[PDB]
Amino acid sequence: GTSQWLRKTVDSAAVILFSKTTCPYCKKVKDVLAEAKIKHATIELDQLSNGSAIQKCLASFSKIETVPQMFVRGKFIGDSQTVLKYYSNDELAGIVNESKYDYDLIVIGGGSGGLAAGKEAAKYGAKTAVLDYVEPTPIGTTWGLGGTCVNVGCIPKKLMHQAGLLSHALEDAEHFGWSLDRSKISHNWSTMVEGVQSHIGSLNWGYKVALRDNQVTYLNAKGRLISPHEVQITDKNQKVSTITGNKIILATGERPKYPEIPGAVEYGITSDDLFSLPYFPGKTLVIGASYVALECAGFLASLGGDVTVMVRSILLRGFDQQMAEKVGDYMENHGVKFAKLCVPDEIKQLKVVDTENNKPGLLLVKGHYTDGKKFEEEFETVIFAVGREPQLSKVLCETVGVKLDKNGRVVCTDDEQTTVSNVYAIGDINAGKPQLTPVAIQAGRYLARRLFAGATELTDYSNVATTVFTPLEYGACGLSEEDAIEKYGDKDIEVYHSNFKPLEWTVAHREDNVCYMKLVCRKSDNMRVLGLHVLGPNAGEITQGYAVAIKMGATKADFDRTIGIHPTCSETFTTLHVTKKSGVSPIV
């Protein structure tokens, strides 16, 4: 038990010192390693519950039972007198650098998960390389280090959402006494994009500086795993070579899907292209109904665009469907048009994109509704948001033996291990896990600590909160109402709900009964909160704190006994009382 932990910790740590906080001989060894700039993990046996047993068990490796004991890649190096000997004789540097492989860790993929994993491992003395390459889009778009979120995801999407929110702030300012005239103000797309791209560039740079300062080797090259320990790399000059590593972390993420119809790849774009587009999209069709489709259609409409969303079946498949419909009704009331139960058949080119004068082209989109009627309309831009997929055939040779599921994602144990013992996977390509940046960062940092510092904590993937940044934001944590009922039966489920109006909306003359919130609870388990849902401004700020309480097992009684902060939107969660079964109206 203890002994199986110790063997696993010793075998995979790069450099590790066993010690106690008081021990002055340990302090002498720590001082030598600091002076020679040798990074290492440290385990202070006196701070651990079973430190006595661990100490006895070290002798199975070193034949000694005292501290300090220093190990390098599974080999006992010595006590303090022996380490000082190697230092004094100029032998320590070569001992700590001796390895069967080029690297202790190779990370394939330089995004949210891979960067976090690599930097954390480097802190404990693991010799680390991170590989990142960005395959250009069909029209040639490419970007720098940091992955999907940084370059073509959460960061530019929320900045453009903020640009759209400011249009309503300009409107609201008149009612609060400011002299501006909202009608004579317009928006400049390219000025926005320049500011967004300047911030993204500061993040690209900041990650390169962070890897340099952690002594991580950064290769801007494409990686391919050809055997358990061998990674083939291809250069920007197409030079091919092979590097070896003890542990491998696959963190290569996903890219957007295109439907298989004429004209889609040639004349449409995806979110990969949208966030650096040199011209305003103009009259735009968004095909799809994911959070990506709706977030992009939302800010384009707030920025003055003529926008249509073409919806195959429902909005936000997989989210609470009452909330999804409230999200769509708000967008439709504020300018977004919807072509419901409709699918595209072909895109035709009427005008080529005008790169010189910085203007879009023109397209004809033909499609059909599910009853067979025809759709035909002209747009300047067509954005496909119909899902994302990994392409692990470009990353992972089939003979390595890494098992994939029917969607092409990696099948992992609860500690991220693949079917190949030294190979792990994190982030969007880990099958069945929520596909979010904070999850990938947590999994990558926690994994690096288990590999190289003897940690045991696992990543907890349950009840992870989300926020959809539509024009009215939607935050959630836990089960949808229909999933709770499916799992426990309608008679065991109580739903408390209420409309509400932000105080900021009163003087602004905004809508009375559009914002909404509900708690979905289990009667037979002391009214446990199974899911929390809120539609309103700053919904992500509102939701985050409640995710700690749900993690801890909060009940309806816990919300009732906590006092609200006034005046806020979030305080409405502390006084809920109208149930859905009562039939009483939730309006204010």
Ligand X SMILES: Cc1cc2nc3c(=O)[nH]c(=O)nc-3n(C[C@H](O)[C@H](O)[C@H](O)COP(=O)(O)OP(=O)(O)OC[C@H]3O[C@@H](n4cnc5c(N)ncnc54)[C@H](O)[C@@H]3O)c2cc1C
Ligand Y SMILES: c1cc(CNCc2ccc3c(c2)OCO3)ccn1
Kindly report whether the peptide bond that precedes residue 68 is cis, defined as omega within 30 degrees of 0: yes
Does 2 engage in binding with ligand Y (CB under 6 A)?
A: yes
Q: 342 or 530, CB closer to a copy of itself?
A: 530
Q: 169 or 352, CB closer to a copy of itself?
A: 169
* Residues in region 368-397 near ligand X by CB under 6 A: 394-395
Exposure class string for 202-236: b at 16+ Cβ within 10 A, else e: ebeeebbebbeeeebbbbebbbbbeebbbbbbeee
Identify the three-state secondary structure at position 533: strand
Tell me which of ligand Y, a copy of itself, ligand X, none is bound by residue 114, counting a contact when its beta carbon lies within the kind-specific cut-off of 5 to 8 angstroms. Answer: ligand X
Nearest of 144, 122, 96 to residue 211 by alpha carbon? 122
Sheet holding 69-72, edge to edge: 41-44, 15-19, 69-72, 75-78
Select the span of 59-67, 143-151, 530-538, 570-578 touching ligand X (CB under 6 A). Answer: 143-151
Select the span of 56-64, 248-256, 359-367, 451-459 touching ligand X (CB under 6 A). Answer: 248-256
Does 437 engage in binding with a copy of itself (CB under 8 A)?
A: yes
Tell me which of a copy of itself, ligand X, ligand Y, none is bound by residue 251, counting a contact when its beta carbon lies within the kind-specific cut-off of 5 to 8 angstroms. Answer: ligand X
Q: Are 460 and 524 in contact (CB under 8 A)?
A: no
* Residues in region 527-566 near a copy of itself by CB under 8 A: 538, 540-549, 551-554, 558-559, 561-566
- Measured CA to CA, the distance from residue 412 to residue 92 in angstroms comes to 38
Q: Is 215 annotated as a binding residue?
A: no
Q: Tokens in use for 561?
A: 């006994």
Residue 577 annotated to the active site: no
* Residues in region 95-134 near ligand X by CB under 6 A: 108-114, 131-134
Which secondary-structure segment (H or E) carries 217? strand 217-219
Q: Are 26 and 19 in contact (CB under 8 A)?
A: yes
In the complex, what is the shortest distance from the CB of residue 157 to a copy of itself, in angstroms, rounded to a whole number?
9
* Residues in region 544-583 near ligand X by CB under 6 A: 566
Tell me which of ligand X, ligand Y, a copy of itself, none is bound by residue 570, counting a contact when its beta carbon lies within the kind-specific cut-off of 5 to 8 angstroms. Answer: a copy of itself
- Measured CA to CA, the distance from residue 330 to residue 225 in angstroms comes to 47
In the complex, what is the shortest distance from the CB of residue 222 to ligand Y, in angstroms, rounded to a whole number?
4
Residues whose CB is less than 8 angstroms from the CB of residue 283 and which lie 6 or more positions away in sequence, other chains included: 305, 306, 307, 378, 379, 380, 381
* Residues in region 470-499 near a copy of itself by CB under 8 A: 475
Residues listed for the chain: 588
Select the span of 114-122, 123-131, 230-238, 377-385 touching ligand Y (CB under 6 A). Answer: 230-238
Does 26 engage in binding with ligand Y (CB under 6 A)?
A: no
Nearest of 141, 116, 140, 143 to residue 130 by alpha carbon? 116
- Give one DSSP letter per residue of 272-303, joined into a string: HHHTT-SS---SEEEE--SHHHHHHHHHHHHT
Q: 50 or 97, CB closer to ligand Y?
A: 50
Q: 451 or 542, CB closer to a copy of itself?
A: 542
Does 236 engage in binding with ligand Y (CB under 6 A)?
A: yes
Identify the three-state secondary structure at position 494: strand
CA atoms within 13 Å, Cβ hemisphere of 511: 13
Q: Is 397 annotated as a binding residue?
A: yes
Q: How far apart are the first and last CA of the chain?
A: 59
Q: Is 55 annotated as a binding residue?
A: yes
Annotated catalytic residue within 334, 533, 566, 577: 566
Residues contributing to the site for ligand X (CB under 6 A)? 108-114, 131-134, 147-149, 153-154, 157, 222-223, 251-253, 271, 292, 394-395, 427-428, 435-438, 440, 566
- Binding site for Ca(2+), by residue number, is 560, 562, 574
Catalytic (active-site) positions? 566
- Binding site, by residue number, is 20, 55, 67, 80-81, 112-114, 132-133, 148-149, 154, 157-158, 222-223, 225, 252, 255, 288-295, 312-313, 317, 387, 391, 397, 428, 435, 437, 483, 509, 560, 562, 566, 574
